[PDB]
Amino acid sequence: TSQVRQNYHQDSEAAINRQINLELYASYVYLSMSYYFDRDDVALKNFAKYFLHQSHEEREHAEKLMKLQNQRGGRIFLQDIQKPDCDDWESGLNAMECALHLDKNVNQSLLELHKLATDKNDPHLCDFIETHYLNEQVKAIKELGDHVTNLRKMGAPESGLAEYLFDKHTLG
Amino acid sequence: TSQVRQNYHQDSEAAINRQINLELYASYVYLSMSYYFDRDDVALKNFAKYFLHQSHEEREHAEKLMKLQNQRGGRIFLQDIQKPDCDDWESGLNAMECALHLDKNVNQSLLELHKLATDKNDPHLCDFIETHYLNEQVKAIKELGDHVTNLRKMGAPESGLAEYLFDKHTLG
Amino acid sequence: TSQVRQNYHQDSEAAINRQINLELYASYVYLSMSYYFDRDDVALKNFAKYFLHQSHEEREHAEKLMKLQNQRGGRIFLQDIQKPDCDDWESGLNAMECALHLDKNVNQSLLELHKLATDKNDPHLCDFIETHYLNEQVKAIKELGDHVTNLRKMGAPESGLAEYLFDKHTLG
Amino acid sequence: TSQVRQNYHQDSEAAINRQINLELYASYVYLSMSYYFDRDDVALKNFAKYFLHQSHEEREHAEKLMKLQNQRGGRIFLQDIQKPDCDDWESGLNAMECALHLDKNVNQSLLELHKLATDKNDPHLCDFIETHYLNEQVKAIKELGDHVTNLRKMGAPESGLAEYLFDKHTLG
Amino acid sequence: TSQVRQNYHQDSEAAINRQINLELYASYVYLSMSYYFDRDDVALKNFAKYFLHQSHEEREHAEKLMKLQNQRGGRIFLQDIQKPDCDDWESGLNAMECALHLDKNVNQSLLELHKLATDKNDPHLCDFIETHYLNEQVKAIKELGDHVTNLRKMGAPESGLAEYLFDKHTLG
Amino acid sequence: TSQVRQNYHQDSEAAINRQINLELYASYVYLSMSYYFDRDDVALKNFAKYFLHQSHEEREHAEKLMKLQNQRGGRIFLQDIQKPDCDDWESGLNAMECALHLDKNVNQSLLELHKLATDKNDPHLCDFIETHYLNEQVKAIKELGDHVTNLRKMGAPESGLAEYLFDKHTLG
Ligand SMILES: [Ca+2]
Ligand SMILES: [Ca+2]
Ligand SMILES: [Zn+2]
Ligand SMILES: [Zn+2]
Ligand SMILES: [Zn+2]
Ligand SMILES: [Zn+2]
Ligand SMILES: [Zn+2]
Ligand SMILES: [Zn+2]
Ligand SMILES: [Zn+2]
Ligand SMILES: [Zn+2]
Ligand SMILES: [Zn+2]
Ligand SMILES: [Zn+2]
Ligand SMILES: [Zn+2]
Ligand SMILES: [Zn+2]
Ligand SMILES: [Zn+2]
Ligand SMILES: [Zn+2]
Ligand SMILES: [Zn+2]
Ligand SMILES: [Zn+2]
Ligand SMILES: [Zn+2]
Ligand SMILES: [Zn+2]
Ligand SMILES: [Zn+2]
Ligand SMILES: [Zn+2]
Ligand SMILES: [Zn+2]
Ligand SMILES: [Zn+2]
Ligand SMILES: [Zn+2]
Ligand SMILES: [Zn+2]
Ligand SMILES: [Zn+2]
Ligand SMILES: [Zn+2]
Ligand SMILES: [Zn+2]
Ligand SMILES: [Zn+2]
Ligand SMILES: [Zn+2]
Ligand SMILES: [Zn+2]
Ligand SMILES: [Zn+2]
Ligand SMILES: [Zn+2]
Ligand SMILES: [Zn+2]
Ligand SMILES: [Zn+2]
Ligand SMILES: [Zn+2]
Ligand SMILES: [Zn+2]
Ligand SMILES: [Zn+2]
């Protein structure tokens, strides 16, 4: 036991390690999606830049959780970062839909981490999750839903015109 | 009777109080319309910003009428601000059409206030309505008609492409 | 059900809609109080500016709750904004006392919204209420109590000298 | 009972008064430690400046809790500030170890204040403790542990070379 | 005995330790007085800021005496800082009167420290007390007497108008 | 087959996909090493920053290879990123030694990619590997060897003084 460890349940330490993996995984999904749109037969550069930015943000969230684990005197245990479910993401709309589903899955996990923070009477961890994770996750989910809606209303994915215009006018 | 009251008919005082309510009401309609377009399943951010700006302008018109009531020595009597007729505004085109109908209704009321100013030989009130209300109301009505026309010519509301492009290129 | 809705109880959605109305109502009370002090037979311009600023802040709080409702995938349902209880606010001291009572009522409602957030295990909503509402409400309540106390210690409301000097030296 | 008091348990008011004392006490410990290192026979000026800065920060935390007590309508009751346990702090390493133990004791007390905030359904107090106290306390504890570790790894306290170099390279 | 100790009587070392405590005590009195005026039922913000500034100055005087003790090779021995005599300071005038009585008590003690400096033929200590303490103490005493006089001439404490105006026009 | 694919062997496409994985893996090793040194019981902040910078650089090298794969009309196939061999890196010296061994392994793989570029008469790929990878890999290897040597000459790992001073004077 760390000299700094105080009020930090073994279960919370483990939950943080699982969330770190999940953030790295989301980072990897977004990186895959980014370079899918960089393919010559897809060629949507702002979709590509958009998901590359999300990939970097996720990796930074993983790092912030690593920082928190060490601040509390927990021990970081890293796991493999699983390859994404898809190599080929089909369309702008489908990738945005997958991103939305991914981000709701990460949120659910973050909500479970918070419930555990409650259960274990760990208000530091509760504020950490609340301040740095829950609202950003809600804003990202809202933004991704906004994007899915526009793309669908614009006629994506059948309309490659729709995705091209959304790439320029929303993601540019 | 106020120490400042001069040439200010009881009927005009009451008409100003009704116009104040009507401006607050228009402010409320535009606020409702604004956040309709901020929904994740509508997601037209410039329609949302556009109507939020109109909402603020109406509230400021209400305040200017309150100022005028007190300048003339009338007494402000406020009434409930009725909720808008719709919670769901359907489309960009429909909201613009509703706004146009709303603004022509506010104008009619302002014209009636002016007729009453004439009837009561109140040139201060007549100039107030003329300078600060009638031309702005005419410009807003013209702008809203311009918008309705474009949206219709672009294929709105069936074309969600049309509303999306109008949101970017006119309201952005 | 919204594509973005996650961990958002029906009861919380409804509580947010009631809080939106209550913020618009507070905005309306402060607007009424503002223009009361703008009357020629009251004539306290800094009391008027003070309450006009509070009116604008409340309206902005309503808007932020509307934003939150949409972020979480709830549906905004607006209600009439009731006219304030008074048309005539009597004095600086009485208006400040009414404001203090109003702000403690809004706070109670916000505390109930937070209890419901707890009950429903909704930490996003809990942080929202905590970060953006509870402390500002506490600071406003403290400021209003500070004002009521000074006015009373200065001899308000019997002393119109007291209100005049407080208008200049505190609210100016 | 204060005109501003709302949702503020007698037990919470008393807990805040105990935390105020504990912050003033920590301020006093750090001040004592500061001037120990300013002695001619110790002479570690950056250890001295470091603890003087911590002393000032604690006093500022006490003041912020006093502010909070008054904001909520509680009544401040001050107690003697006890002299620190030691007049002579032995070494850089020992003072850092004592500081770490002190800061974990203050944290435990802050965690108990938060539990009480939970028990009493006082979310304003809960956010106050969370935002302004719990994370700063965690960062300070982490920093102090980092320092203790370096000093020990460097051969402190037997090595006066170690403390001298740490004073220059970490605390300078 | 310190390698730097020269011409420094045991009695002077002890007198400095008693003066350090007395400065910390004055700091504590002024802090208590400060937050008394920050109460919602007192609400004199410039009285509060005024005494907070005095509290900080006293603490800095304590620190300067600690510095001097170490410069001369004396050993700092800290004692409890006693809680102030009052929790409730009654009025602006009464707090200023208490401050004046406090500052004359600190001065008397400083004069006794100087007499002892004379008795012990310690001109360094004599100049220290003279340059850094005696004139500042005289100016503070004069300022506090000036304040007490104005407040009394203005009708304080019965006139809460008087304290309110003095707070704005002298302490602001 | 891509419309842009020219002179790009199936074996080279696959080799690029293996190198992408290996760069992501190196990024992960360096991230693990970074947060090891951020632990309270290790506490070498410049070792931590150093390896965090290397982690970011590797991830950027992976991204540049993804870019190249798409430029040539190859198809990106991502694989799991394996967790590093160690959770606990022991010391500054040991981590630097592991980094050096890692970087020589990545280099060997890059040399094999280049041999394959030669074998397949792919001069674009050969220049890519040469310009953007081989010299940077050589400089990194040289720098890591320089670090290992200093740490060993300084008495690391037995001397925690040595690692502490190297952290300040070389990595700071
Ligand atoms: Ca919070
Ligand atoms: Ca002199
Ligand atoms: Zn994330
Ligand atoms: Zn990073
Ligand atoms: Zn796998
Ligand atoms: Zn995310
Ligand atoms: Zn919490
Ligand atoms: Zn929580
Ligand atoms: Zn209008
Ligand atoms: Zn306004
Ligand atoms: Zn109605
Ligand atoms: Zn209008
Ligand atoms: Zn006219
Ligand atoms: Zn006319
Ligand atoms: Zn509000
Ligand atoms: Zn607004
Ligand atoms: Zn009504
Ligand atoms: Zn309010
Ligand atoms: Zn919470
Ligand atoms: Zn809560
Ligand atoms: Zn503290
Ligand atoms: Zn301070
Ligand atoms: Zn004691
Ligand atoms: Zn502390
Ligand atoms: Zn809470
Ligand atoms: Zn809490
Ligand atoms: Zn050095
Ligand atoms: Zn003093
Ligand atoms: Zn100081
Ligand atoms: Zn005592
Ligand atoms: Zn003094
Ligand atoms: Zn002398
Ligand atoms: Zn002398
Ligand atoms: Zn590399
Ligand atoms: Zn990148
Ligand atoms: Zn594995
Ligand atoms: Zn490398
Ligand atoms: Zn070549
Ligand atoms: Zn070659």
Curated annotation (Swiss-Prot), chains A, B, C, D, E, F:
Annotated positions binding Fe cation 1? E23, E58, H61
Residue numbers binding Fe cation 2: E58, D103, Q137
- Give the UniProt record's GO annotations in the biological process aspect: immune response; intracellular iron ion homeostasis; iron ion transport; negative regulation of cell population proliferation; negative regulation of ferroptosis; negative regulation of fibroblast proliferation
Residue ranges occupied by any Ferritin-like diiron domain in the UniProt entry = 6-155
Site features described as Essential for association with cargo receptor NCOA4, chain residue numbers: R18
Q: Reaction catalysed by this chain?
A: 4 Fe(2+) + O2 + 4 H(+) = 4 Fe(3+) + 2 H2O
| InterPro entries membership | Ferritin, Ferritin-like, Ferritin-like_diiron, Ferritin-like_SF, Ferritin_CS, Ferritin_DPS_dom
Q: Cellular location of this protein? A: Cytoplasm; Lysosome; Cytoplasmic vesicle, Autophagosome
Keyword Translocase present in the record's keywords: the answer is no
Q: Name one GO molecular function term.
A: ferroxidase activity
Q: Which domain of life is it from?
A: Eukaryota
- Tissue-wise expression: Expressed in the liver.
Pfam families tied to this protein: Ferritin (PF00210)
Answer whether the UniProt record assigns the keyword Signal to this protein: no
Q: Which UniProt keywords apply?
A: Acetylation, Cytoplasm, Cytoplasmic vesicle, Iron, Iron storage, Lysosome, Metal-binding, Neurodegeneration, Oxidoreductase, Phosphoprotein
Membership in a protein family: Belongs to the ferritin family.
| Function field | Stores iron in a soluble, non-toxic, readily available form. Important for iron homeostasis. Has ferroxidase activity. Iron is taken up in the ferrous form and deposited as ferric hydroxides after oxidation. Also plays a role in delivery of iron to cells. Mediates iron uptake in capsule cells of the developing kidney. Delivery to lysosomes is mediated by the cargo receptor NCOA4 for autophagic degradation and release of iron.
Q: How does it assemble?
A: Oligomer of 24 subunits. There are two types of subunits: L (light) chain and H (heavy) chain. The major chain can be light or heavy, depending on the species and tissue type. In the human liver, the heavy chain is predominant. The functional molecule forms a roughly spherical shell with a diameter of 12 nm and contains a central cavity into which the insoluble mineral iron core is deposited. Interacts with NCOA4; NCOA4 promotes targeting of the iron-binding ferritin complex to autolysosomes following starvation or iron depletion.
Disorder noted: Hemochromatosis 5: A disorder of iron metabolism characterized by iron overload. Excess iron is deposited in a variety of organs leading to their failure, and resulting in serious illnesses including cirrhosis, hepatomas, diabetes, cardiomyopathy, arthritis, and hypogonadotropic hypogonadism. Severe effects of the disease usually do not appear until after decades of progressive iron loading. Neurodegeneration with brain iron accumulation 9: An autosomal dominant neurodegenerative disorder associated with iron accumulation, primarily in the basal ganglia. It is characterized by global developmental delay apparent from infancy, and progressive decline of motor and cognitive skills. Clinical features include delayed walking or inability to walk, spasticity with hyperreflexia, ataxia, dystonia, and poor or absent language.
The name this protein goes by in its record: Ferritin heavy chain
Tell me the organism. Answer: Homo sapiens
